[PDB]
Amino acid sequence: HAPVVAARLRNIWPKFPKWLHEAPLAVAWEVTRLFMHCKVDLEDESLGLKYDPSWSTARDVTDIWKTLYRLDAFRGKPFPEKPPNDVFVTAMTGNFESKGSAVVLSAVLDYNPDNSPTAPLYLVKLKPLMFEQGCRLTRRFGPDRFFEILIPSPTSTSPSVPPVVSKQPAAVEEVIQWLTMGQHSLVGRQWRAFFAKDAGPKPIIKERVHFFAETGITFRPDVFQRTEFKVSQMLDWLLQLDNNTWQPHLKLFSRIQLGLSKTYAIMTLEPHQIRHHKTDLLSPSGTGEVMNDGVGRMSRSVAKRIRDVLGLGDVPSAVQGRFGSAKGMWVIDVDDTGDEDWIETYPSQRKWECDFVDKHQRTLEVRSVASELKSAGLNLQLLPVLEDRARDKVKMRQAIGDRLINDLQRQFSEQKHALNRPVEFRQWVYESYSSRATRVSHGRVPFLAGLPDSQEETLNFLMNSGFDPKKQKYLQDIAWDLQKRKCDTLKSKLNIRVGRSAYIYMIADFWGVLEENEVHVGFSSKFRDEEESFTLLSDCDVLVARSPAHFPSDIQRVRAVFKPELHSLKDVIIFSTKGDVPLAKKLSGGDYDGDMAWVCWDPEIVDGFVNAEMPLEPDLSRYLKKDKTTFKQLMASHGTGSAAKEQTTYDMIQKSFHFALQPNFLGMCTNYKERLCYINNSVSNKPAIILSSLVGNLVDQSKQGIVFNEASWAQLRRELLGGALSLPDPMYKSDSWLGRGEPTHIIDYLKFSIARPAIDKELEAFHNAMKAAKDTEDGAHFWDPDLASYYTFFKEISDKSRSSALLFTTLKNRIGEVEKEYGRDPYPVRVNQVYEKWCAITPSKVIRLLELSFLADREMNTWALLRASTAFKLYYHKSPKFVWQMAGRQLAYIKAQMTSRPGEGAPALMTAFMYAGLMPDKKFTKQYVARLEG
Amino acid sequence: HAPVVAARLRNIWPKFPKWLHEAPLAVAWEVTRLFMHCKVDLEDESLGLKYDPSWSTARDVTDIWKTLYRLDAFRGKPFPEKPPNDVFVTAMTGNFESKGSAVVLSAVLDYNPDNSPTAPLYLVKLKPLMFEQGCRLTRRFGPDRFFEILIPSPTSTSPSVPPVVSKQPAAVEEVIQWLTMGQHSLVGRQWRAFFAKDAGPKPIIKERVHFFAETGITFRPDVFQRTEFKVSQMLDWLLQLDNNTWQPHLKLFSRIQLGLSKTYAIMTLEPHQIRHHKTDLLSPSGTGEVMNDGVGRMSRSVAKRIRDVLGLGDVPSAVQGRFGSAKGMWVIDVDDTGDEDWIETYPSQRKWECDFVDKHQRTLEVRSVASELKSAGLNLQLLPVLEDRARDKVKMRQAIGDRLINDLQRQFSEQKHALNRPVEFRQWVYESYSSRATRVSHGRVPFLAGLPDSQEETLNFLMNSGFDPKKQKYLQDIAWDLQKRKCDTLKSKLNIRVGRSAYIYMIADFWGVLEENEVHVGFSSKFRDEEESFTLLSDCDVLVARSPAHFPSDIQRVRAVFKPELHSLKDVIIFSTKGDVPLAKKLSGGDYDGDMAWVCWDPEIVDGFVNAEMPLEPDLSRYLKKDKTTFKQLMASHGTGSAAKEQTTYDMIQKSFHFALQPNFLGMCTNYKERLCYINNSVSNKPAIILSSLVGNLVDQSKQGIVFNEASWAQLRRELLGGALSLPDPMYKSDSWLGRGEPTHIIDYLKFSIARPAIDKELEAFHNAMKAAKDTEDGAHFWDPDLASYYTFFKEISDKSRSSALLFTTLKNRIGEVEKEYGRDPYPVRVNQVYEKWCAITPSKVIRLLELSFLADREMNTWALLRASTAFKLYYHKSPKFVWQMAGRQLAYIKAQMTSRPGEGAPALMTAFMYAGLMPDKKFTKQYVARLEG
Ligand SMILES: [Mg+2]
Ligand SMILES: [Mg+2]
């Protein structure tokens, strides 16, 4: 209770008018969207609203907008963005649920640029209805009963946040109280907050908040659409709270995310088909250490059902999933020769005490599946630890630089060789970038004016009509804008490719075949590495790590040993369940609940590596303070019974919001550690081990109820390190070397001594080169007599003219006016405006032939060809970008017309749709060139 | 010495004129080709020949033919076929050798249709110069010194052979004597025969004969281009005869093929890098049985050199090859951790005693490499043995029929579902047939008149311009001509697909890890089988066989056991070197010199199979007679010394020709066995075991010097079987069931009770269907108002006309005349003649716009569009095939023009070349449809 805030926080939501009370939910939503967008008051008695019965039977939102919109006070504009028909129909007539898809109600709030109280504080914009995969909670209660917002974080220091908030300390408490203390009215429902989390110049970070429709003017009571139902009951259904009062309430709150997790429901197992283990697999040595933390077995038939329902090409050996209170990985049991469905759970997987009675508690839900692997490369964060652990560091670093030089050299040589032939450049362009998703989405290649959106797509579009990148300059210009942008990217991550490396899901050996420092890795298909290929790993040492590696021991060298017993388990890496300490825990305190290991079998990287043992970690208890207050202790303030428990549930939501919305130090302490280790150039000295242990403990902050605030951070740096004082940014944060002398920090050296010279050297190759291009024959020109084809044709006619002649003159004149327009708001919109003036350049018996009006698409007439060529003749000079951008499309037609030769095959006129479905045939390219070259 | 033959056999070769003696070899060859083809005498003094100096510097044969040809008496015609430039240049200026390629001199002889002696007997036609991969012998002596012919077999009974030959018993001896006894003059060289072999209504089979240029008017003596050199010396170089006189001379002659084998030379190994073993790996049990017959190890570096020189994507684990006298397989040694080059040979691989001194004796030559595997299916010849060996035969046969029904059902359902959408039908059409090699060869899709050659290519060409197979009838007609032809093929091999089967090179276990009935099979990549995938085989039983399987024991069930020690050996199957008898020898007396096993791991096929032991084979020595006469015994007729040895060599050639040219009984006895086993319906009774043993012994007939003639065949059937008497053909040789009642012989049953009903039932589905197609809207029509577009445009103009009008009338008239021409010699030539009359239908200011003469390709003008549409309007009726075949190409353009819509993307005009390089993108199709279907 500030109050300042309020009154601000009025009144934040759009009102729900009486004329609109006959809904339905989806109409209410999408109509409210047209009103807010057009800036139209929904409680206006000047507009004569109303309610179109027709909206009730609507199958396209555009019908409930053209209403409307009409009225005159709606124009505007057009838009809102608009929900897709199939989505809208589902929301209208399919229960907000289409197979696995939920219809999602969402909004984004931004601070009100306005001011004074009693202005809102937040502006709300309602997103269009959309599909997203459902989750346990939307399958149980209905997708239409869930609402989510993105909202500016109330503890966001700073500086672009309203004064009104935070120069008024706690009302951070007022914002949360607004969020959580009562119901929010939106589109005729009563929404209550039950979850908050982080989101999926310098902007204000937003937090995602989830609301549940507890009631609304369509619901009905109760005990004992659509029935009234409280958040406390919903969460009790999810978490079986009676049996989980022993839990730290912040940790219990964090489990709510497991009901919100977007998942694929696979199948519901019968109780007799479920095996709950009372104990985990423990260390053979008696350490009591859990050896299979987060991982269990499933039958083979269960995995086949997953292939089936998900439509996988193959039975997956392991999946990341949920099952009642259980969360983690399940791996096929290699000993399963039956055909009966079963799954097991282990204590380490079960996040609350669950009776597993209702079918939703016994449904296997899949988050992700073990899939075919792809090369991982080396991330620069692994490098300091790899260098630290090197038997010989000078050689390691010479080798890594040589590797970067070679790979770069290698990619340049392939680009420049491919550039020498249209079939080959097309193949190279196609391979350089995937356009399939864009093509699938549009049912064609999208165009901006007369050319594809995409530079890559523009190159191939033009080459497919016969242009040559070594002959035409525009093609040339784009080809190298592309190579430039790619150089920029390389100098900005140090993701050195290591062909023999991959990120692989970690699984534990239930079957007792792997000795302690042995791992089993078999692949589902051929893993290729330039000259060599692998279907599995055997008799070699490998490096394993989890990102990020902080401790010297966070990367381990072990032996890859293929066990025939585990042959069927593919695209996972199996760790031993022997020894004192699971291998997973050595990899940055990891486990088997979805962790993936960086696995490296590259000999040069593996062979110089020496294992370090686990660090003696410091006691950080003075700084890291765990709130261990249980749900039972919170309930003691209210008493006993149902009302006591209900209020305790809401207490937990409010106290946990107050915890979730505190600043994140993980990021801050990680950056300090980056900076400190950089200046020290050490990841293994005492300060380094302290900060790595620190950030390690902050990862589980939320479910450990660790309180760590500013005073404690300062105290900890005061007492154990620095340098309150900002540490300087590493030099590698800058674009150029701003250091003194030669780089010393392996990253500085790789970016500044190695990468930067090599890049600039590789770019001096074809600016050289540019430059090397008058009448060698070769080279590359804007001129192409083929494209002045129709120009010269009609000038001849034109001669001769009488009055064609006059038509031809108007044409040249108008083109001139439009090039002037091109000379002079976002970019695509301005280009369109000019394109539209361009297309507006329009013409017995000669005009009829040029116009071909029986064609619905103007831009396919002979006139368009003539207009394009005339513009080319007049402006290839002069304004090359103008002509190509407007008329690229018809220049291409003309080129394909002109280069055609009798008896040398037929040019193909492809529809936009059918063209989008073809790709370059790499075998054709390869075989055709091979025959060209003798 | 008949003589009858001669004089016939004159004078068989084209003469070599004096005016042509200044060569060069290639000019002589190709000029002689123009003369023989045009029917022009090369010893003509009426023509004023001559010799163009310009021919000497020629780089295109067309230059030495347009000479010429000229003259007037050369027209004619055009052709000969013509050698490719790169080939001609190599022959002219590159020594007949281009890298690995030899330029080949070849001719085909056919019996002279003429008659009387002194007519030739044979007509000779000289093939155009061509590239073929070289061989040991052409690398050693030069490709230009080798000549090969195809020649009618002189023992070819019958009946279309000249009376003159064989109704004159032995002159089979006169033909061979002509071939072998002396030199043959051809294009100024003296050719001597050194090898003969079988070739690579009912025609007369030809035999391939090889000649060596021993001298010619350009050569020079000798001892001690291009030097004189005898065949006896050449063969002595090849076979090191001094050390091989112990060999049966027919067997020694058969080794000549090893110098002729087309191969890739890889690398030459130093003597210290070669390991010759004195003994093979022998049976552990003391049987003395060779356990690695034909197989040896090579180092890893040797295999990498093979990947290198051959340009393989991967190091091959094994190769089929030659190396001095050694022939067989070499497999990488898994124990090789060095990087030194080495190879070994074993006695079983070495086919003569070789000192391995010259570099050509120490060069590894590769015939083929172990490559990625593909599904094999079940051939019908395996079936009788599989049925014989079935634990339960009634169930086996029920199962096999069900499988055939299901697979058929399955392929029909996929075809008919794909047919429902142009993107999907295109994808299905593309997958149904590979056109890439044709496309690579032409640098485009070849057209016949207005459409692609290929029906499949025609469908996609038309769909890519917007036609729909469910809407247009012509597209429909072709789509189903295609499905018909494919049904015809299925009813005509019983190649029942078994997804889990492959043909795999057999290798022996040098490393002692496989127990006797264990095999090791790992694949180089994912082997897919519908719902399941394999990178290797482990813990299952498998069937192994070599085709053909005759004995009940020729198929064996064994255990697939993956050995980690052999993990690196991929796409080969390793057999144990333990036990009494190598597994290879049990598979139809096979071995490890290139044999491939049918490997089957399909559970349903494997599980009912019971192994039989080796048959007690009969003694066939009375019928099968081995000529064991050695080279030493032949030399005893001439004496001792160099002249004696030389004449003995020629004796061996002549006696061995006389042996090679005897009738082949393998084929005849195999067919008798087919027929006998069919009537008996048994492959395991005594007659069956006798005939299988018979054909087994006849396989090695040539190098075993087994004499087996007609009298002995008759004697053997008289004494051990039948039925001299022809046995009837199996019923399955006929197209319809001509048997009595239900088929009893599993093949009769599968073809007649199962396949034939199912096929006819699956074809009654879409003739039904045809038929189900007036104005449901749907269905499929010839009419398309889009294609009458230009017709209606110009009729309107035309109106209105004055005199366009007159132009339009001539146009319709001419089209009419050309459709009449289409109504009325090979097919493609006649179509062209009409196409040419079609293209000849040709037109101030209106004609100029229709004609667009600045376009080099007429068929891209607006006139062509108008002509095509007018013809369509007039004739879609009437003659649908006429219009589409002539104007398909412009109908497509019009369709793509007409269906284009503003703001729905741009049609693409692709060049013929660039169009040939694209393929349907299966991921696009799949993803696009998935979004279409919600
Ligand atoms: Mg984890
Ligand atoms: Mg063999």
Author numbering:
A (entry chain A), B (entry chain A): 390 to 589, 604 to 627, 641 to 1240, 1252 to 1270, 1282 to 1372
Please, what does the article write about this entry?
We report the 2.3-Å resolution crystal structure of QDE-1, a cRdRP from Neurospora crassa, and find that it forms a relatively compact dimeric molecule, each subunit of which comprises several domains with, at its core, a catalytic apparatus and protein fold strikingly similar to the catalytic core of the DNA-dependent RNA polymerases responsible for transcription. A cell-encoded RNA-dependent RNA polymerase (cRdRP) is also involved, in plants, fungi, protozoa, and certain animals, but apparently not insects and vertebrates, producing dsRNA triggers and hence amplifying the PTGS response. The polypeptide chain then leads into a “catalytic” domain (residues 647–807; 914–1,161) that houses the three proposed catalytic aspartic acid residues (D1007, D1009, and D1011) within an active site cleft formed between two DPBB subdomains (DPBB1, residues 690–792, and DPBB2, residues 916–1,018). Overall, QDE-1 exists as a compact, but flexible, dimeric enzyme with metal binding sites confirming positions of the catalytic sites but with extensive additional structure whose biological functions are less immediately clear.
